[PDB]
Structure formats: structure tokens, C-alpha cells
Design a protein around this ligand. Structure first.
Ligand SMILES: *[C@@H]1O[C@H](CO)[C@@H](O[C@@H]2O[C@H](CO)[C@@H](O)[C@H](O)[C@H]2NC(C)=O)[C@H](O)[C@H]1NC(C)=O
Lengths: 131, 109, 182
């Protein structure tokens, strides 16, 4: 029974930080890449960050470039996102999405630039920035 | 950013095509286009991956396609439950990130 | 040892794939890479330019032919109608996935009906288990002996490859290695 429960909701102020934990059970967490995706209220979907097979490759979005930090923990099967200095535009519903087990390489060098989408998705932390 | 229409309309039994036009570095670079079914109030589920592969669980009504730099989708025999939105997904090497679509509110008359 | 699987004349359809072991030999592994003739070369557990360790007992090479956009179902996970009813490689995988185009070899203008894929199976396929039977599916009705009438489906379906198809529909030949020891 694959699932992904994530926590860290609440209403915060512009100019401080937060952390978003995300559990994972039922599958092998220590082999599959993991993403973070957010959705402005009523608007479309957007992509934030990605964390690789072990924690070596991290690519960030166009908007969170310099404000976000993603970590992971294969001991308790839990992904982490550290949002630093939240602006008044970072309000969304944050989805913790399972990536793909893809960790291929030809001529040695491993890479994370794939095709495959996000198979199973989380439930959503709805953080809100306001004054 | 992938150009996607805001809303498509179709009576039951008909065939509605949700287009999606991307750039020359988004889809025309050679990365696959996937589609998501997001019901209102529910996390999205992967509808089609790899431009044609339907996973285990989606019925045989969602076709999916890709042609050059502009992919598409097609729903034949659409019923009264397809009220969901339908985004896209791809890769952009010029942005080194994963892009999404814009949203197409499919409504059934 | 494997100028016999990557260069075979007639490839197998995916529902009846040909599991071929190779043992008691010096495996080259240096002609698979340094060659630009592959569309996808994705090796998962062990890396290329490192697999000169002792896998000389039971290296396997599973070969079949599938359509172009169904190459994405030969990864760990990645369910579909190929990785569920035709060929399911497991989650903890260590081999490499190799796939090149075969548009000039496996295409006829009328359509090759020798290639098939099993569309209707009762349960999902286990990791590395094959099924070649031809049994009428009996999807929803009370089952019968099999007359192929109403709600009675033939358990295989052809691809019908053609030269002027799209690149997602052109025939691709896939060879999947698998190493295991004792
Ligand atoms: C399948 O056969 C082709 C040609 O029959 C092989 O391609 C040649 O392999 C030799 C091996 O030393 C190379 O020197 C040539 O440069 C190759 N030709 C080209 C155009 O690349 C191919 O290696 C064979 N595949 C195997 C053995 O897996």
C-alpha cells in the first residue's frame, strides 16, 4: 500500500523560514528520486526542486533559485524541504511526489535529466504567507 | 511554460482533444510529454506517461500523442465524471528543470 | 559471446521472449558501449565501464521487439500493458536496457502480423515469467469454451508495423541484460 503523507502546514509571516517533512511507506525509498511541486490557489501547477538517488544531484526551479533547500533521509524514509525567507508569493499547496527509480548512465556518468513523470503523489501541505 | 488552452467542452459520447503547444527547447528538444488528471480537491494522478503509455488503472479512452513540438490528447466517449483539469509536463534543458502546462478545465455538458 | 543476440536476424514478439543465458566465456562488454548506434542505453544497478568483475556465470540477455513509445515500460516500476501482461522486469534491477531502432528491418507496407503483444491476461505478470498460451479471455460474461463472439476476446494482438509511421510507433528492438551470481 504505497502512500506519501507530508506535514508542515500553517500560516507564517513574510521573511522567516519553514520545513516540510514527507513520509513514505510501502515501497523502497532508497532507490527512487523525489520531487517537490507546488500549486498557487486556483492557478496551475509548478515545479520546485528534486533530490537524486542518494543526495548528489539537486536542481531547483526558476523562482525558488536561492531561497529553497531540499534534503532527504533514507533512515526513516523521509524527504525534507527547507524554504528560507518566504516571500508573500510562496503560498501554495505543496505536493510531495514520487519521481522515478531511473538512475541510468552510459559511459559511467550518472544523471538526472529524465523523461518519466511523477507516479504517485502526496496529500499537500498548504502553507500560507500573510501579514 | 507550455501553451495550453483554458477550457475545452464536449457533450457525452463525443471526442474532445486537449492540445498543448510547447517551445523548441521544451518538447522539440526531445523530452516526453505526460498528462495529469487533477480532480478538484485531490492530488493529481499520472494519466499518460512517455507520450503513449497508459498506466494500469486508466481506461482505454485516453489516447495521447506527440507531434514535433506540440503534443495532444484525446478523450473518446467522455462521461459525467471527467470534470478534472488536465495539465502537461516535460523537461527544459535551457532551464535545467521540469516544466508544467497551464490547465484545461474540461467540462461535460 | 553476444554477437548472437544484438545482431539476430529474426527477433521475438514480446509475449514470447527468448531468455538466453551466456556462461563459460570471457564477456567483452566493450562493444556494447563506445557505439552510437543505440537509441537508449540505460544501465541501472551496476555501471558501464565498471562491469569487469566476476559475472561469468549466468549473464542473461532477453530480447523482444516493441513499439517506440513502449520502451518506457522496460524500467523498474513503470506499469502499462507491456510491463503487466508481456514482460515485467523487477524493481530491484541490475542489468542494462538496450534499445535501437529497427524501422528498415521490421516494417511492411501492408503490415507485419508476426509480431504480437498479449493484451488480455487474468493477473499481472511476475518478475521474469513468460506466458505463451492462447485462451479466450471471458472478460465480463459467464465464461464459455471460446467462440470469439460477443465479450470474447482473442488474447493476442498484432502491432501492424508500417514504414511511414510516427517515431513513437516505429518498431524498436529491445535487449535487456541481467547478471546474477552464486
Ligand atoms: C553487429 O554487427 C555489426 C556489423 O555487422 C557490428 O558493427 C561493427 O563491429 C565491428 C567489430 O569490431 C567494428 O569494428 C565496426 O566498426 C562496427 N561497424 C559499425 C558501422 O559500427 C556490431 O558491432 C555488431 N554488434 C555486436 C557484435 O554486438
Amino acid at each position: 500500500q504505497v502512500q506519501l503523507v507530508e506535514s508542515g502546514g500553517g500560516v507564517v509571516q513574510p521573511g522567516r523560514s519553514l520545513r516540510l517533512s514527507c513520509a513514505a511507506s510501502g515501497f523502497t525509498f532508497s532507490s527512487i528520486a523525489m520531487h517537490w511541486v507546488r500549486q498557487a490557489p486556483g492557478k496551475g501547477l509548478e515545479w520546485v526542486a528534486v533530490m537524486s538517488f542518494d543526495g548528489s544531484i539537486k536542481y531547483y526551479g526558476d523562482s525558488v533559485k536561492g531561497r529553497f533547500t531540499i534534503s532527504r533521509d533514507n533512515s526513516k524514509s523521509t524527504l525534507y524541504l527547507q524554504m528560507n525567507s518566504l516571500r508573500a508569493e510562496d503560498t501554495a499547496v505543496y505536493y510531495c511526489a514520487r519521481g522515478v527509480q531511473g538512475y541510468y548512465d552510459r559511459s559511467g556518468y550518472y544523471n538526472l535529466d529524465y523523461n518519466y513523470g511523477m507516479d504517485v503523489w502526496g496529500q499537500g501541505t498548504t502553507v500560507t504567507v500573510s501579514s | 511554460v507550455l501553451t495550453q488552452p483554458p477550457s475545452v467542452s464536449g457533450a457525452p459520447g463525443q471526442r474532445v482533444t486537449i492540445s498543448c503547444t510547447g517551445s523548441s527547447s521544451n518538447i522539440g528538444a526531445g523530452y516526453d510529454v505526460h498528462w495529469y488528471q487533477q480532480l478538484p480537491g485531490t492530488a493529481p494522478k499520472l494519466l499518460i506517461y512517455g507520450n503513449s503509455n497508459r498506466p494500469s488503472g486508466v481506461p482505454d479512452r485516453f489516447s495521447g500523442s506527440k507531434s514535433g513540438t506540440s503534443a495532444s490528447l484525446a478523450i473518446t466517449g467522455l462521461q459525467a465524471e471527467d470534470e478534472a483539469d488536465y495539465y502537461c509536463q516535460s523537461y527544459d534543458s535551457s532551464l535545467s528543470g521540469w516544466v508544467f502546462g497551464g490547465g484545461t478545465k474540461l467540462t461535460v455538458l | 559471446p553476444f554477437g548472437e543476440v544484438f545482431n539476430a536476424t529474426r527477433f521475438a514478439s514480446v509475449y514470447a521472449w527468448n531468455r538466453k543465458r551466456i556462461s563459460n566465456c570471457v564477456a567483452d562488454y566493450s562493444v556494447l558501449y563506445n557505439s552510437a548506434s543505440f537509441s537508449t542505453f540505460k544501465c541501472y544497478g551496476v555501471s558501464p565501464t565498471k562491469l569487469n568483475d566476476l559475472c561469468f556465470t549466468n549473464v542473461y540477455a532477453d530480447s523482444f521487439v516493441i513499439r517506440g513509445d513502449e520502451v518506457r515500460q522496460i524500467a523498474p516500476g513503470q506499469t502499462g500493458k507491456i510491463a503487466d501482461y508481456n514482460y515485467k522486469l523487477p524493481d530491484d534491477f541490475t542489468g542494462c536496457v538496450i534499445a535501437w531502432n529497427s524501422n528498415n528491418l521490421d516494417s511492411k507496407v501492408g503490415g507485419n502480423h508476426n509480431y504480437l503483444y498479449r493484451l488480455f491476461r487474468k493477473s499481472n505478470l511476475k518478475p521474469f515469467e513468460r506466458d505463451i498460451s492462447t485462451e479466450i479471455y471471458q472478460a465480463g460474461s459467464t465464461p464459455c469454451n471460446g467462440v470469439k463472439g460477443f465479450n470474447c476476446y482473442f488474447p493476442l494482438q498484432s502491432y501492424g508495423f508500417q514504414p511511414t509511421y510516427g517515431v513513437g510507433y516505429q518498431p524498436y528492438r529491445v535487449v535487456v541484460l541481467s547478471f546474477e551470481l552464486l
